[PDB]
Amino acid sequence: NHEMKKYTLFPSQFVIAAEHTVQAAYEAQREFGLDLGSLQFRTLKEYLSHEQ
Amino acid sequence: EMMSVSDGVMRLPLFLAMILPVQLGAATADA
Numbered sequence: 421n422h423e424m425k426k427y428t429l430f431p432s433q434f435v436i437a438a439e440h441t442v443q444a445a446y447e448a449q450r451e452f453g454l455d456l457g458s459l460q461f462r463t464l465k466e467y468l469s470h471e472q
Numbered sequence: 473e474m475m476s477v478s479d480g481v482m483r484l485p486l487f488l489a490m491i492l493p494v495q496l497g498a499a500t501a502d503a
Contacts, residue, residue: 422493428485 434472438464 438460445456473480 434468436464436468 440456440460448454448456475481
C-alpha cells in the first residue's frame with residue numbers, strides 16, 4: 421500500500437526608514453556642499469540587500 | 473477581525489506540486 425504527507429510554506433516581512441532634519445541638512449549643505457537625502461537613500465538601498 | 477488591519481483576511485493556500493516515489497532496481501546480473 422501507499423501513504424502520503426503534507427508540507428507548507430509562508431513568507432516574512434521587513435521595514436527600514438531614514439530621517440534627516442532640515443536645520444542640520446542646510447548647515448551641512450552650506451559648509452560642505454553634500455546631499456544628505458541621496459546618501460541616506462543609497463545607504464538604505466544597499467543595507468537592505470546586505471542584511472538579507 | 474477588522475479588514476483594515478490587514479490580518480482579518482482569511483487567506484487561501486496553493487497546491488504547488490506533487491511528489492511521486494522513485495524507481496527501484498539493482499545491477500547484479502553480471503555474475
